[PDB]
Design a protein around this nucleic acid. Structure first.
Lengths: 343, 118, 492, 57, 28, 281, 72, 84
RNA sequence: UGUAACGGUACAAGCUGUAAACAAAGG
RNA sequence: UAGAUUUAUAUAAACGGCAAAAAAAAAAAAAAA
RNA sequence: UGGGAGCGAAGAUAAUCUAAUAUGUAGCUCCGUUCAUGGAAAUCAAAAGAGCUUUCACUGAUUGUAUUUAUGAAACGUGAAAAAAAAAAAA
RNA sequence: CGGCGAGAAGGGAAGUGUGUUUCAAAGAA
RNA sequence: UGGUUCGAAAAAAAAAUAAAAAAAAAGA
RNA sequence: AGGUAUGCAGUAAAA
């Protein structure tokens, strides 16, 4: 109807770029490894990718893969909230789209107060929810070239699958050979590496999902499959060198349910470390501050007194007695419930 | 004659494309190396020396490419600026060339009378 | 009335707005008469500087320059832009990538991007001709700027320079000291000798002397420092009277308040000039030493302020480092005659050396040679990494030195060769540097000046006395050659 | 087609292309901005891509 | 309003100058 | 219904006919512009008005006579100091909502930098944000401290040096013109040094002899020119005027009685009446 | 414009490229650049079509006083 | 913030009431008569706008400022312990 | 794009642009 | 698509603050389109 | 543009006149029409259920608003048309 | 011959008797 | 002899007009 | 008491 405000945003599917004629540089120019866009030697300047370092200082991270359909300011606030978990954030900037300044091109810069805070922040990628297009933001430290671990989630999923397979293998070995000593049983268990699934000695999934074999045995539901019995790393080895693993006699259905439960619990553990809360180890916030935080995402309902005027005269009697009395009764009920909550 | 000149210009532009692309890539790589070298100092390091050697090689290649490009740039941009010998006001010979008037702020902001005395 | 929705409640003004074509509704499969497809558009220049097309964009993109339309002020600005380390990254891009451009960085680069400097020779000639044309309509300050800009950018056409000299000589009596300093800047070492017309130089010096004599009150301390620097170096003057007048105006002209607020770099250059021309000052501690101390104190105060305080700050930090290096080098020569931990000379020298130690990277090759000379003269060391880390960079930057810098470096290396206590890296680095420096000095002997020759002879004598076990023959040859060259130049 | 414009091979800006003919009858497309000849159009073999919407229809 | 001062003297009994500082945390 | 933060709750789900037939004069009080979905005004886009802007309301009486009237926003002219822009910004038109939003964000600079476009509702604010980011990219231009509107346009951004040069040139032209006008209208006139004696009437009897004129300004031509320019700087008087920057300033309304010209029903200016008299807006 | 404005613009341009000497120049290979004549492409090379007596003649645009040649 | 309910309409202008003229702020320095450092005080918007913020005595109580103060105090305590 | 002014053409509600109704047979 | 093709139709918008003269130093300076 | 946005009348009906109707119409300014509008529920409903949005017919000139004139493609619902949700962690 | 159960927001709306029903003010062609 | 042109003084614009055609290397 | 014949800037005085 009218010119669009920032509430109306549009974006379009990007066709993958194919150089159909490799020698035709005029119509199929090379992409730049820095900007990931077509080289334009006539009207562009070379970029080393470190330019923002001269602007934001050494303690700076570049964030990539930011989604569409969001204001640069909204994304700046969200990124500030996320990166506050690692220290004091001096600044957050989000580059606008070439064709829509209200949207982002997909790049941002975060300037930290402390080198240690920035280095801690760079370690893991940032997984976003569906409302942010499920994007996984990739982080790059400008002062050390350190990058985020974009394969962390899928490597951990593979580790969880390997742990379930290890549990099944050990249960089968116990069912076949009977009770076995720990240091001999553990050497019969193998995992498949990520991503090509090459057989390996099972020692990495255990330490990435549980921290140790004792943790694996003592954490549910594997303690419902196995029972450790007495006849640092040195303590672990010595303690395992004098044990026997005994099985809990289960049926096929119970064992299958237990394996599914173990998978689900490990999945929850994986999601927790990616969705750690942003208020962890921070002071409480006043009600006004919490309302200001909320307003970045949601607007409060408009006052009902203003809203009443929308009742059209064609079918409604504006300011009607029964309608207003209904409003008063609802208000009274809400106040009574609040009083009950207080008491 | 103008068809011949057009063919010549296209021929040289098709080489300029590759030379300029290579120059662009060399420039971005050299800037990356220079930033990496600056970021580390005043420390002295074997990695620093290797960066310096790579930078020297890239600088030599860039100079060679620029030397190659200098004549090609001049010939491919010969008709971007007006040659008065080809304009309709100075002659009626066949094959005139016409250029549209530009907006130069430093002149659009001056007050001058419409005097054409030369 | 349609009640708004989540996507529709925000709207922009029909005429005052931010254009966002990605989200604005459009039907590209239809003809739009409003855009006037039939009408051809004009291709404007893609880069402009000072309202005209940028000359740094012409080698790559071409197009007309309109140089003949440029007035004196624009021409002087353009000449400065071309002369002062131009970078093609200063040019404007067209629809650039969202990420920041390399123009943001303040650091210099070891390679020239997008074209060589010599790819602008024709435009340089055109600019020189246009400067000769516009010289008659410029005010005094703009004319001085045009002269200096032509000299610095490298206009060499002799008729152009003759016209410029004529106009400048015409309008010299109407110029104040700042314009005289601007003109003197065009006579710096390395610039074309066409501008060094002896009669014009004599007239400029005489006018500056009259300005000092009749307007000493209005002279600023930084202006006096620049004047002394130019007189000693730019104009190659033996005007002991003028230099002494400048020194007196700097010290006893109620100028102590202004000496604190003047920039330290100007004071460093001034004390360098006085150290070069000591004999003139010490003519009817030494007075030169007192002058050096008076100029040094504010530099040390600025150093102390910076340390106590501990992109913008980088420039001032670099300037302060250069000032410290130059001040230390200037003080070293005077200390050669003192040989004591003088109440303030030695201490300010040590503080400058400490500043150099904490900012070794910022040093230019001349700064490296100066600081090595100062440290070797003082027989001190700001730290244990100083000598090795400075010798490494001196070797890496040997090619950009001048005869004076090479003489200083050779003096320092001769002094260092006689020290028994040295680090392994210093021992390894020394002999190659000594050999290369000796080769460079021998190559550049015919272009060395009298001060450089004297320093080289002193270094040769010191080595013969104390460093007779390293390249002994070359040092005797250097001593004899320096003696003969000094005899010839004194006869000249 | 009016929302689109040909690009000059040298300046890479919207241009106008005229057909000129040599003595032998060879045709040359020339661009107004730089006077450059137009490069030969990319071949159908290189340009070809399947039209999946028609298969869907 | 023939006389229209830019600054109007504030009223003593207006609710604006007497409103309560409110509470930082509602729960306590 | 949905969109409870926006006006029209009971219109959202009543039908198409009611929505198209809605009568604006049904709404007596003004609705906030953001919740109504109203286009920002040019004044709002040239100032920082946040939630406030031109609105409308209806007058209804016991006789059931309806009347709709346009109502202007409550706007003040205030000066701000911006560190990000390195300059004082005089006479920005601001509102109470905008001031409260600046308080919430943490000041003028924070409000300009952080506010989303929908909430800011100010193209001028967006341009200020752009200039702040440009200054961050290029600090050396920030050190000049020029008025921020110098770099409002993108072309000035691309050519900063010409922007500053042109700004100074126009400023100097303005200064020279004003100086010449003041000199022309100055109350002090200095005649030529070769004929300083003006025509006089016969001195009244008993008047003491006037001393010979002291022409100290004839020693040097430079002194003469300086004295002449100084004399040209003089002014006859200085006038007082309404200025909101002064604590005791005020403006004027209409006459005390409140009447009007007899027999004349004056029509107020509109966009279809006296629309473009003497100025665009 | 006031002369201070011109001074300001010139100084802002002058101070836009200050910094330390990164990159090594161990050898002197002179404030104005010198071009070597044996590296410039010849007319034949310049006119040659692209690949994946005109060989002894060079057409150079530049400063002959800065060219490095055996004879001029 | 302003409220859009029952505004005053006069002279063709609209003036909106401010039911809540108070805002919370964090005290960065000792303000005689207001509180000590690190306290969250409800003050008047004018007081914050024209005295406290200009004089650098307090700042708006945003989560950013609160967290920055908390982390700075923790760092200062750790610095004390390191010095000891 | 569309239209028009002058000019040429049967001094024209047509055609047409000072090359003003026609080049198609060039190293 | 063999060439040629005057003049008017106030156009730096193939482009971006508004606002006279398709875009005018800051301020004065004001807006439902 | 009887589509959408802003401002916004009187002649005419009310047998004068007011509201309401005319009508959110005309004029004025701005979008420029299926590659569009809009839109994947903090929805509607009853204690069973439906399932973004959109178009047609019925329910029905019903329940409504106006209370002398008239206005009213109401809501739920029913029968049809069309049918869609979301390629998308990097490569 | 099925067993104490698979992370469902503590918020919105619905009669004011909410024990019950429904939704999540947060995302693409 | 006037207009043009500078001033008054004017985009307060006489459609098909000009000291008014891309604006100095101009080749004397 | 508009501008007169090498022409552009530019200050003062005045039958």
């Amino acid at each position: 109807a009218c010119r669009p405000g920032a509430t109306r945003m549009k974006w379009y599917f990007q066709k993958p770029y194919v150089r159909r004629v490799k020698s035709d540089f005029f119509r199929f120019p090379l992409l730049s490894q820095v900007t990931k866009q077509k080289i334009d030697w006539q009207y562009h300047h070379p970029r080393s990718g470190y330019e923002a370092a001269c602007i934001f200082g050494p303690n700076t991270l570049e964030v990539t893969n930011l989604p569409m359909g969001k204001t640069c300011e909204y994304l700046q606030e969200r990124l500030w909230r996320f990166f506050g978990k690692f220290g004091i954030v001096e600044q957050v900037r989000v580059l606008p789209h070439e064709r829509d300044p209200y949207q982002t091109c997909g790049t941002a810069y975060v300037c930290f107060r402390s080198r240690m805070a920035s280095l801690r922040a760079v370690r893991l990628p940032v997984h976003l929810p569906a409302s942010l297009h499920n994007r996984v933001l990739h982080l790059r430290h400008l002062g050390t070239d350190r990058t985020s671990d974009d394969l962390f989630y899928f490597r951990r999923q593979q580790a969880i699958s390997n742990l379930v397979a290890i549990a099944q293998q050990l249960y089968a070995y116990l069912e076949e050979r009977g009770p076995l000593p720990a240091h001999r049983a553990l050497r019969l268990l193998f995992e498949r590496s990520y991503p090509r699934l090459a057989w390996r000695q099972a020692g990495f999934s255990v330490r990435t999902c549980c921290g140790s074999w004792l943790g694996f045995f003592s954490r549910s539901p594997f303690n419902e499959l196995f029972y450790l019995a007495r006849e640092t790393d040195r303590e672990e080895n010595a303690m395992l060198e004098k044990m026997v693993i005994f099985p809990h006699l289960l049926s096929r259905e119970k064992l299958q349910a237990l394996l599914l439960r173990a998978g689900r619990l490990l999945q929850m553990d994986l999601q927790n470390e990616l969705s750690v809360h942003w208020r962890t180890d921070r002071p409480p916030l006043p009600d006004w501050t919490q309302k200001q935080i909320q307003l970045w995402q949601h607007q409060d309902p408009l006052p009902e007194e203003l809203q009443i005027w929308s009742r059209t005269k064609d079918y409604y009697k504006i300011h009607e007695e029964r309608f207003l009395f209904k409003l008063k009764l609802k208000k009274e009920r809400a106040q009574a419930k609040q009083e009950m909550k207080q008491q | 004659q103008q068809c011949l000149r057009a063919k010549d210009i296209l021929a040289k532009q098709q080489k300029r494309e590759a030379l300029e692309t290579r120059r662009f890539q060399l420039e971005e790589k050299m800037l990356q190396l220079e930033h990496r070298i600056r970021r580390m100092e005043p420390a002295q390091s074997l990695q620093k020396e290797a960066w310096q050697a790579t930078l020297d090689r890239y600088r030599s290649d860039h100079e060679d490419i620029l030397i190659q490009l200098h004549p090609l740039r001049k010939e491919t941009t010969q008709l971007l600026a007006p040659d008065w010998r080809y304009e309709r006001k100075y002659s009626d010979l066949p094959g005139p060339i016409r250029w549209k008037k530009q907006y130069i702020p430093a002149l659009e902001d001056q007050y001058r009378k419409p005097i054409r005395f030369h | 009335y349609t009640p708004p929705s989540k996507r529709t409640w925000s709207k922009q003004h029909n005429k005052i707005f931010t254009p966002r074509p990605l989200s604005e509704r459009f039907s590209p499969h239809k003809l739009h008469p409003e855009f006037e497809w039939w009408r051809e558009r004009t291709v404007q220049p893609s880069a402009l500087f000072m309202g005209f097309p940028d000359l740094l964009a012409l080698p790559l993109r071409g197009g007309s320059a309109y140089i003949h339309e440029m007035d004196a002020a624009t021409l002087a600005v353009v000449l400065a832009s071309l002369a002062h380390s131009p970078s093609a990254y200063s040019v404007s891009e067209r629809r650039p990538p969202p990420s920041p451009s390399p123009a943001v960085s303040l650091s210099s680069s070891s390679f020239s991007p997008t074209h060589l400097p010599q790819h602008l020779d024709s435009l340089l000639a055109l600019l020189g001709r246009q400067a000769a044309a516009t010289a008659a309509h410029a005010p005094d300050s703009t004319l001085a700027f045009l002269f200096r800009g032509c000299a610095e950018a490298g206009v060499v056409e002799k008729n152009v320079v003759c016209t410029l000299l004529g106009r400048v000589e015409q309008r010299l009596p109407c110029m104040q000291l700042p314009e005289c300093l601007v003109l003197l800047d065009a006579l710096r070492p390395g610039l074309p000798e066409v501008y060094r017309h002896p009669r014009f130089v004599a007239r400029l010096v005489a006018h500056a002397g009259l300005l000092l004599q009749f307007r000493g009150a209005e002279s600023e301390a930084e202006d006096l420092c620049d004047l002394a620097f130019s007189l000693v170096f730019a104009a190659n003057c033996r005007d002991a009277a003028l230099l002494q007048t400048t020194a007196l105006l700097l010290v006893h002209g109620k100028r102590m308040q202004s000496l604190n607020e003047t920039a330290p770099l100007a004071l460093a250059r001034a004390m360098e000039a006085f150290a070069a021309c000591r004999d003139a000052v010490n003519a009817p501690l030494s007075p030169s030493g007192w002058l050096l101390l008076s100029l040094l104190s504010p530099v040390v105060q600025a150093l102390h302020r910076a340390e106590k305080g501990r992109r913008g700050a980088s420039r001032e930090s670099h300037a302060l480092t250069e000032a410290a290096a130059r001040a230390a080098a200037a003080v070293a020569e005077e200390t050669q005659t003192l040989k004591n931990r003088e109440s303030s000379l030695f201490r300010g020298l040590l503080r400058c050396l400490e500043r150099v130690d904490d900012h070794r990277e910022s040093l230019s090759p001349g700064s490296m040679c100066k600081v090595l000379f100062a440290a070797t003269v003082a027989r001190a060391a700001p730290s244990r990494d100083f000598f090795p880390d400075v010798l490494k960079r001196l070797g890496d930057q040997l090619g950009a030195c001048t005869p004076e810098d090479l003489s200083r470096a050779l003096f320092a290396l001769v002094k260092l060769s006689s020290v028994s206590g040295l680090d392994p890296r210093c021992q390894d680095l020394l002999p190659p540097l000594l050999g290369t420096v000796l080769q460079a000095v021998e190559s550049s002997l015919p272009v060395a000046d009298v001060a450089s020759l004297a320093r080289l002879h002193s270094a040769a004598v010191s080595a013969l006395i104390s460093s007779s076990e390293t390249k002994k023959e070359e040092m005797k040859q250097l001593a004899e050659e320096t003696s003969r060259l000094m005899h010839a130049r004194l006869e000249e | 087609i009016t929302n689109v414009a040909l690009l000059d091979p040298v300046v890479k800006r919207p241009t106008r292309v005229k057909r000129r003919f040599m003595m032998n009858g060879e045709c040359v497309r020339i661009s107004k901005l730089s006077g450059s000849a137009m490069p030969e159009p990319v071949s159908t073999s290189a340009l070809r891509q399947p039209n999946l919407y028609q298969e869907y229809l | 309003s023939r006389y229209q001062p830019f600054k109007t003297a504030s009223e003593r009994e207006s609710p604006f100058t007497e409103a309560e500082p409110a509470t930082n945390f509602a729960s306590p | 219904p949905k969109n409870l933060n926006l006006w029209g709750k009971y219109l959202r789900l009543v039908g198409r006919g009611a929505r198209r037939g809605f009568k604006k004069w049904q709404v007596i009080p003004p609705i906030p512009v953001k919740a109504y979905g109203r286009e920002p005004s040019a004044a709002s886009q040239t100032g920082l008005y946040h939630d406030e802007d031109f609105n409308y309301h209806t007058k209804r009486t016991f006789s059931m006579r309806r009347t709709r009237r346009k109502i202007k926003p409550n706007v003040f002219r205030r000066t701000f100091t911006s560190s990000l822009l390195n300059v004082t910004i005089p006479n920005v038109r601001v509102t109470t909502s905008a001031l409260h939003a600046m308080d919430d964000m943490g000041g003028f600079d924070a409000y300009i930098l952080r506010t989303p476009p929908q909430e800011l509702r100010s193209h001028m604010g967006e341009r200020m944000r752009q200039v702040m980011y440009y200054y961050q990219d290029q600090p050396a231009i920030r050190d000049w401290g020029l008025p921020w509107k110098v770099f409002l346009k993108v072309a000035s951004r691309r050519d900063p040096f010409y922007a500053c040069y042109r700004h100074n040139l126009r400023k100097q032209q303005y200064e020279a013109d004003l100086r010449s006008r003041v000199r022309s209208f100055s109350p002090y006139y200095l005649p030529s040094g070769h004929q300083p004696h003006a025509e006089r009437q016969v001195f009244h009897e008993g008047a003491g002899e006037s001393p010979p004129l002291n022409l100290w300004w004839r020693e040097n031509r430079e002194l003469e020119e300086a004295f002449r320019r100084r004399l040209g700087e003089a002014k006859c008087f200085e006038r007082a005027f309404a200025d909101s920057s002064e604590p005791l300033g005020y403006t004027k309304g209409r006459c005390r009685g409140g009447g009007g010209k007899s027999g004349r029903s004056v029509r107020r200016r509109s966009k279809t009446h006296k629309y473009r008299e003497n100025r665009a807006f | 414009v006031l002369p201070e404005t011109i001074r300001l613009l010139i100084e802002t341009r002058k101070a836009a490229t200050a910094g330390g000497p990164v990159g090594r120049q161990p050898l002197p290979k002179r404030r104005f650049p010198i071009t070597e004549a044996l590296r410039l492409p010849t007319v034949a090379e310049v006119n040659a079509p692209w690949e994946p007596r005109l060989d002894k003649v060079v057409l150079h645009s530049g400063d002959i006083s800065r060219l490095r040649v055996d004879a001029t | 913030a302003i409220s859009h309910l029952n505004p005053s309409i006069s002279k063709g202008k609209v003036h909106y009431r401010v039911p809540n003229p108070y805002i919370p702020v964090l005290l960065l320095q000792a303000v005689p008569g207001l509180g000590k450092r690190g306290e969250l005080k409800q003050v008047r918007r004018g007081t914050l706008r024209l005295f406290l913020a200009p004089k650098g005595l307090a700042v708006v109580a945003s989560w950013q400022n609160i967290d920055a103060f908390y982390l700075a105090e923790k760092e200062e305590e750790e610095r004390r312990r390191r010095a000891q």
